[PDB]
Amino acid sequence: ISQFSEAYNKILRNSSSASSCQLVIFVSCLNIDALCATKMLSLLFKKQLVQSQIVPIFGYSELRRHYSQLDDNINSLLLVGFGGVIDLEAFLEIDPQEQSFRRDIYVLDAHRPWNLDNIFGSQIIQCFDDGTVDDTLGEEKEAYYKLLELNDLSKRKQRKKQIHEYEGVLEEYYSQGTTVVNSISAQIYSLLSAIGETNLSNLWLNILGTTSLDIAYAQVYNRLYPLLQDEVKRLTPSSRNSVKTPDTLTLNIQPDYYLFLLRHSSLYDSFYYSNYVNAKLSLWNENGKKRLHKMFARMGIPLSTAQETWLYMDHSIKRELGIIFDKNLDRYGLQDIIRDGFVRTLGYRGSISASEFVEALTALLEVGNSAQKLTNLRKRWVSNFWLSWDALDDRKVELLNRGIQLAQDLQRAIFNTGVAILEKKLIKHLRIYRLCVLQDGPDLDLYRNPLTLLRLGNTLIECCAESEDKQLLPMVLASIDENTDTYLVAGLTPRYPRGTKKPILNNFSMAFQQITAETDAKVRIDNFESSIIEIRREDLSPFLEKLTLSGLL
Amino acid sequence: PNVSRTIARELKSFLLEYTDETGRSVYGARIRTLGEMNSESLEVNYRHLAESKAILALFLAKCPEEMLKIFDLVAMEATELHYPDYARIH
């Protein structure tokens, strides 16, 4: 509810001291956006050389272990991606200490709607709600100034009728789907441009941030291109090349493709594993696989030349890469492939597509790495976080490729198993919504991570619906290996075929909390996201039955 | 001979719009097959060629040599109209 620059000067005044400082910025959690945000944030701190702690939090339940344990001198705290949904004032408590409260916890979140207790009643925040939903948002505005603090019998009856009158519309709010408005990174950059830093790798961090989520919607991002492209116009390494030159040597616009790993993998394998194209061409089917080859017969690209790594393909095919696709792809309905994208060239190393980089980092997060076992695993993910954090750095590229050799493999897993599902037609159309469960599969170790099931769930909800009449219906998935029937189940959102009228607001967040409040059968919201929960095989089936009814949508 | 060129004008007609088993041109589907497989062997049944005309079948039992060279260039023409490419393939 504040100016970004002024919130900045506040976090400046409470910061620098002897001993320095102290602030812990919480990077959270598994979302690439977090990295994108906190890296340019951390670089900004290093600019004024302000000491910082930075914590890799996984579990939402895990945050309590930290904040309740170690705090001493820390008067100014910062947090990322948490608290937009569940309020930490009740969750942490707080317990006001010393107006002009000593500690300011900044909470940065893209999630909506905000918790009601957060924005109004200033204690721990210093909210980041600005500027996306301001709004009004008159529904939260009347939620308090009316409620607080609230012949005489008719005035009591009138008063109470008014109270429930506000409580109904208030109940409409805060019970709702969790949907990201704008990427937190973008706003950190809006905060950053007011201070005056135009830095190139910074901007690349923004591009990374925005393009973190294009796998899932945009939704506003379709109109974020002005806010990026203009900035790309606010700077330039040289008016003209001047090949290369070995330095600056920076990012530029190119006809990029939702196509998967075009530059770091072989072309044919790049269609065959791509996510958008899995769908339209029915590639899980042997009968459709051929249709790809017909694409190549249309392009005049040899099959043998399609099998070869993209660095080494002939030059003629490169110069025709932006034409041939226009000549052909239009006929297959694949006409939405070509985006205007961002590509940063490091020169003699190669170039990297904005999206593919994100595929590298995601790749890093799950691989390349009774409560003791889950804690130890979540711990392994915590360590792995930094292995992924390092790849963002420019000076070490040598491990970034270790991401990509993984990002390929994962797909080779994911695709494979994905097909293993469609052969058995495991989809349960049900009535109100679509649902699935993986009872068996190869290498569930890869599927342990929330984000792995976010991407498999994504290629699957993308595959089932082209569309593909009728009625985009949200999907459900489940997997188990070890940790005694943890059976991780993540919520999902429907995918429109590039024509998106409504955000549609994932409802699993609410539907799960209704069940936690009913019989709560081995239901665990331990994962940071409201869409993803844990379950046991003993209680999963009654849970599934209680999921089927009553349907909130 | 140049007269033989006119023969091509006939055999191309045999190459695409010829049908059998209630529609669904077979040789069109072979060209489509390679085609995708791009195995560069187009395959023509002698039964059908002899079914349309015995005059060409007689040319196969007299002088296959130069006639296959006349024929396969036209096959390349048919693949050319069906897939406006393979100037780069074979």
Side-chain angles (χ1 to χ4, degrees), chain A residues 1-156 158-553, chain B:
Chain A
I1 50 185
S2 39
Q3 285 307 107
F4 289 144
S5 37
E6 279 316 299
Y8 181 65
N9 311 140
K10 185 176 86 177
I11 190 77
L12 282 188
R13 294 167 70 185
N14 301 340
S15 286
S16 42
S17 278
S19 295
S20 297
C21 165
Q22 195 54 253
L23 62 315
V24 184
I25 62 100
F26 297 113
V27 190
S28 69
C29 183
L30 177 301
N31 291 336
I32 292 206
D33 188 42
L35 298 176
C36 296
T38 59
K39 177 57 186 182
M40 41 177 297
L41 198 46
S42 181
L43 184 140
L44 186 146
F45 283 165
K46 291 181 47 190
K47 172 166 186 177
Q48 286 153 349
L49 295 171
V50 186
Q51 294 284 348
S52 70
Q53 182 76 257
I54 294 174
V55 175
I57 309 99
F58 180 67
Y60 176 86
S61 168
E62 185 67 25
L63 183 144
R64 178 188 295 179
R65 181 177 181 170
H66 289 304
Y67 180 84
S68 185
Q69 185 176 2
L70 312 155
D71 299 302
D72 294 321
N73 55 342
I74 294 96
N75 47 1
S76 56
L77 177 301
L78 188 147
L79 189 150
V80 164
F82 283 170
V85 179
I86 307 95
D87 176 19
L88 276 57
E89 185 167 27
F91 185 82
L92 294 181
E93 68 166 337
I94 301 93
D95 186 37
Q97 297 152 336
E98 191 251 356
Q99 210 189 347
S100 192
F101 290 97
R102 54 177 200 86
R103 183 184 299 175
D104 299 321
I105 304 94
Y106 295 94
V107 158
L108 313 168
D109 192 355
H111 299 54
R112 303 297 182 275
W114 287 93
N115 199 313
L116 293 156
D117 293 351
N118 286 339
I119 305 178
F120 298 82
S122 178
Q123 170 86 46
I124 61 171
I125 54 93
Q126 209 41 75
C127 44
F128 191 59
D129 184 32
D130 201 53
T132 52
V133 184
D134 175 62
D135 193 11
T136 50
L137 188 22
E139 185 184 358
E140 185 172 359
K141 192 187 176 178
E142 64 171 346
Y144 275 147
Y145 299 81
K146 304 294 176 304
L147 202 276
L148 276 312
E149 67 288 343
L150 68 74
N151 296 337
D152 286 345
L153 298 175
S154 185
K155 304 295 296 180
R156 181 189 178 264
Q158 184 60 233
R159 182 182 58 193
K160 298 304 181 62
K161 187 187 54 50
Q162 286 174 344
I163 293 174
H164 296 75
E165 186 64 24
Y166 302 130
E167 282 166 0
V169 191
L170 178 58
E171 184 62 26
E172 198 274 342
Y173 191 89
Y174 173 85
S175 67
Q176 208 183 331
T178 52
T179 49
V180 161
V181 177
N182 293 323
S183 301
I184 64 186
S185 192
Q187 286 93 9
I188 299 193
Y189 181 65
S190 75
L191 185 150
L192 188 147
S193 196
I195 322 168
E197 291 83 13
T198 45
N199 287 337
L200 296 161
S201 58
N202 289 337
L203 193 55
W204 178 257
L205 287 152
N206 295 311
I207 306 173
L208 295 174
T210 55
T211 313
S212 177
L213 62 80
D214 282 4
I215 304 176
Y217 52 88
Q219 180 64 258
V220 189
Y221 166 67
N222 295 125
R223 76 187 46 89
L224 262 183
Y225 289 110
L227 299 178
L228 281 174
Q229 292 178 350
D230 290 342
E231 302 283 347
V232 165
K233 277 191 302 187
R234 291 173 70 259
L235 62 80
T236 291
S238 301
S239 179
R240 191 62 62 173
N241 300 287
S242 301
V243 162
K244 295 277 296 208
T245 60
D247 291 337
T248 53
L249 177 63
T250 67
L251 62 80
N252 215 11
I253 52 100
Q254 295 176 355
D256 301 340
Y257 303 134
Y258 302 94
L259 188 147
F260 178 74
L261 284 186
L262 193 139
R263 296 158 179 278
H264 309 158
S265 61
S266 55
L267 201 53
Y268 175 82
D269 294 325
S270 178
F271 280 92
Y272 178 78
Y273 292 121
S274 284
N275 193 17
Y276 163 81
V277 160
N278 280 348
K280 183 154 292 290
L281 309 189
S282 288
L283 294 171
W284 63 97
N285 284 327
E286 306 164 353
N287 289 336
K289 177 190 299 291
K290 300 286 288 180
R291 195 175 154 92
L292 196 61
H293 305 105
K294 179 197 296 178
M295 299 176 52
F296 284 132
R298 285 294 170 95
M299 300 166 184
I301 306 175
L303 184 60
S304 300
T305 282
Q307 302 286 334
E308 145 175 23
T309 292
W310 192 85
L311 278 165
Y312 299 166
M313 295 179 72
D314 293 335
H315 188 43
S316 66
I317 295 186
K318 304 312 186 183
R319 296 181 281 107
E320 292 309 300
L321 187 64
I323 286 180
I324 290 183
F325 279 0
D326 181 65
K327 181 180 304 168
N328 289 335
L329 273 296
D330 176 62
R331 185 193 171 266
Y332 293 88
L334 288 190
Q335 178 58 84
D336 306 329
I337 294 169
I338 295 100
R339 295 176 64 186
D340 303 330
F342 285 173
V343 160
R344 168 189 182 75
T345 60
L346 208 49
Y348 307 104
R349 282 189 191 64
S351 313
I352 305 91
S353 303
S355 62
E356 298 307 339
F357 192 89
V358 173
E359 292 305 304
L361 307 186
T362 45
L364 286 179
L365 298 177
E366 47 263 35
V367 68
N369 63 332
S370 181
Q372 185 61 56
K373 309 184 54 64
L374 72 95
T375 50
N376 185 24
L377 185 149
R378 295 175 174 185
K379 194 171 66 63
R380 184 183 59 91
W381 290 347
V382 167
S383 299
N384 200 16
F385 178 102
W386 292 110
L387 190 138
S388 178
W389 168 269
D390 184 1
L392 177 63
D393 302 358
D394 307 337
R395 62 182 51 187
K396 313 179 185 56
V397 198
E398 310 174 0
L399 62 80
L400 170 60
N401 290 300
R402 186 177 182 175
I404 294 175
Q405 292 175 357
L406 288 175
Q408 303 193 161
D409 175 82
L410 288 187
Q411 287 305 346
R412 181 192 304 169
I414 294 169
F415 189 88
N416 191 22
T417 311
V419 177
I421 291 163
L422 295 173
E423 287 181 354
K424 296 184 289 294
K425 300 171 53 182
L426 301 175
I427 295 86
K428 268 67 191 179
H429 176 268
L430 305 191
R431 289 188 297 268
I432 300 175
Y433 64 96
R434 283 177 189 97
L435 189 161
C436 293
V437 42
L438 188 147
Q439 59 177 8
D440 185 71
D443 285 338
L444 280 312
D445 278 351
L446 287 179
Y447 301 126
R448 289 181 177 297
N449 192 303
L451 290 194
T452 312
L453 260 54
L454 190 55
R455 298 167 68 209
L456 165 71
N458 199 57
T459 197
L460 251 66
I461 194 150
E462 176 65 27
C463 168
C464 55
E466 271 80 4
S467 57
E468 187 72 16
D469 287 353
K470 311 184 164 313
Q471 191 53 269
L472 295 301
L473 285 179
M475 298 289 294
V476 182
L477 286 183
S479 66
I480 185 49
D481 203 346
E482 285 299 330
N483 299 85
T484 66
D485 300 343
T486 59
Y487 280 81
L488 186 137
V489 176
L492 286 164
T493 75
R495 304 301 169 188
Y496 297 77
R498 301 299 177 277
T500 300
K501 177 61 182 186
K502 291 304 169 185
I504 62 100
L505 262 76
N506 185 338
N507 301 151
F508 282 106
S509 53
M510 321 178 44
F512 291 155
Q513 289 173 342
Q514 288 308 96
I515 302 170
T516 64
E518 175 197 357
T519 50
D520 52 46
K522 297 310 172 186
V523 199
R524 300 183 166 182
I525 313 199
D526 312 314
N527 288 296
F528 60 104
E529 190 54 38
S530 61
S531 67
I532 169 178
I533 58 176
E534 294 178 344
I535 210 76
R536 304 298 299 277
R537 65 171 297 269
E538 312 171 336
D539 294 327
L540 70 71
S541 178
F543 169 83
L544 300 172
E545 296 182 337
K546 295 164 185 185
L547 181 54
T548 54
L549 55 91
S550 66
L552 271 66
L553 66 94
Chain B
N2 301 126
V3 185
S4 294
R5 176 182 58 189
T6 63
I7 301 179
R9 309 176 51 185
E10 188 276 335
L11 57 87
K12 181 182 300 182
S13 182
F14 177 74
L15 195 42
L16 62 80
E17 78 265 12
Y18 170 82
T19 56
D20 213 322
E21 295 107 345
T22 321
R24 298 198 169 271
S25 307
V26 170
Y27 297 147
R30 301 298 182 72
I31 293 193
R32 180 179 61 92
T33 306
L34 62 80
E36 293 175 342
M37 183 63 176
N38 58 70
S39 75
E40 75 180 327
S41 178
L42 192 157
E43 201 275 316
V44 170
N45 286 289
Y46 174 60
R47 298 298 177 260
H48 305 171
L49 188 52
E51 189 283 331
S52 285
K53 270 175 311 311
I55 186 167
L56 291 178
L58 185 63
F59 291 160
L60 285 170
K62 211 185 81 184
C63 296
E65 189 84 337
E66 64 267 28
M67 185 179 53
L68 280 191
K69 178 173 297 296
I70 298 170
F71 184 81
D72 70 337
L73 293 183
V74 183
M76 178 48 179
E77 297 301 333
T79 305
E80 179 72 24
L81 64 85
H82 195 278
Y83 297 147
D85 263 347
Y86 297 70
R88 301 185 57 91
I89 321 296
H90 305 131

